[PDB]
Amino acid sequence: ASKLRAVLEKLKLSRDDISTAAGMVKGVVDHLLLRLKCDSAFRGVGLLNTGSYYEHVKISAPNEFDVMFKLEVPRIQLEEYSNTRAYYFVKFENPLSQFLEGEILSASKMLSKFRKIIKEEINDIKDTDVIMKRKRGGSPAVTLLISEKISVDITLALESKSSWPASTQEGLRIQNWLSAKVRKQLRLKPFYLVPKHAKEGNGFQEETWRLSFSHIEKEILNNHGKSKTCCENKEEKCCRKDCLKLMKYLLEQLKERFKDKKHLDKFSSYHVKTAFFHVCTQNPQDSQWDRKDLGLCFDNCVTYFLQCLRTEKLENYFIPEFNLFSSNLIDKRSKEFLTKQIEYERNNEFPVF
Ligand SMILES: [Zn+2]
Q: What is the DSSP letter of 311?
A: T
How far is 231 from 225, CA to CA, in rounded Å? 8
Distance from the first to the final alpha carbon of the chain: 13
Per-residue CA distances from 277 to 225, 281, 343 (Å): 12, 6, 21
CA of 311 to the centre of ligand 1 (A): 30
CA of 174 to the centre of ligand 1 (A): 16
321 is in an annotated binding site: no
Alpha carbon 334 to chain centroid, angstroms: 22
91 is in an annotated binding site: no
How far is 221 from 216, CA to CA, in rounded Å? 9
How far is 199 from 201, CA to CA, in rounded Å? 6
Three-state SS string across 131-168, please?
A: EEECCCCCCCCEEEEECCCEEEEEEEEEEECCCCCHHH
Q: Which long-range contacts (CB under 8 A, 24 or more apart) does 166-173 make?
A: 167/80, 167/85, 167/86, 167/211, 167/319, 167/321, 167/322, 168/211, 168/318, 168/319, 170/320, 171/316, 171/317, 171/318, 171/319, 171/320, 172/216, 172/317, 172/318, 173/281
* Pick from 213, 166, 173: nearest CA to 189: 213
196 is in an annotated binding site: yes
How was this entry determined? X-ray
CB contact at 8 A, 90 and 101:
no
How far is 147 from 144, CA to CA, in rounded Å? 10
Domain positions in the chain are 1-13+164-190+213-353, 14-163+191-212
Architecture of the domain defined by 1-13+164-190+213-353: Orthogonal Bundle (1.10)
How far is 226 from 177, CA to CA, in rounded Å? 6
Bridge partner residues of 184 (DSSP):
none
* Pick from 133, 156, 162, 152: nearest CA to 42: 156
Bridge partner residues of 193 (DSSP):
158, 211
Resolution (A): 2.4
Alpha helices in 97-239 (DSSP H): 107-121, 180-186, 214-221
- Cis omega (within 30 of 0) for bond into 204: yes
For the four alpha carbons of 88, 308, 230 and 284, in that order, the dihedral sign comes to positive
Amino acid in position 266: K
CA of 99 to the centre of ligand 1 (A): 44
How far is 135 from 140, CA to CA, in rounded Å? 9
Residues with CB in 5 Å of ion ligand 1: 225, 230-231, 238
151 is in an annotated binding site: no
Angle made by CA atoms 182, 183, 185, in degrees to the nearest 5: 65
301 is in an annotated binding site: no
How does 78-115 read in b/e, with b if 16+ C-beta sit within 10 Å? beebeebbbbbbbeeeeebeebeeeebbbbeebbebbb
Q: Which long-range contacts (CB under 8 A, 24 or more apart) does 305-312 make?
A: 305/247, 305/272, 305/275, 305/342, 306/339, 306/342, 306/343, 306/346, 308/275, 309/335, 309/336, 309/338, 309/339, 309/342, 310/335, 310/339
Three-state SS for 268?
coil
Q: What is the DSSP letter of 41?
A: G
272 is in an annotated binding site: yes
167 is in an annotated binding site: no
The number of CA neighbours under 13 Å toward the Cβ of 179 is 6
Residues in the chain: 353
CA of 22 to the centre of ligand 1 (A): 26
Per-residue CA distances from 206 to 85, 100, 112, 350 (Å): 16, 14, 15, 41
CA of 119 to the centre of ligand 1 (A): 42
CA of 238 to the centre of ligand 1 (A): 4
CA of 219 to the centre of ligand 1 (A): 13
How far is 264 from 117, CA to CA, in rounded Å? 34
How does 52-74 read in b/e, with b if 16+ C-beta sit within 10 Å? ebbebbbbeebbbbbbbbbbebe
327 is in an annotated binding site: no
64 is in an annotated binding site: yes
CB contact at 8 A, 294 and 338:
no
How does 281-320 read in b/e, with b if 16+ C-beta sit within 10 Å? bebeebebbeeebbeebbebbbebbbebbeebebbbbbbb
According to DSSP, the β-strands at 64-72 and 45-47 are antiparallel
Three-state SS for 72?
strand
Alpha carbon 244 to chain centroid, angstroms: 13
How far is 123 from 121, CA to CA, in rounded Å? 5
153 is in an annotated binding site: yes
The number of CA neighbours under 13 Å toward the Cβ of 95 is 13
CA of 226 to the centre of ligand 1 (A): 9
224 is in an annotated binding site: yes
CA of 140 to the centre of ligand 1 (A): 34
Domain 14-163+191-212 falls under CATH 3.30.460.90:
yes
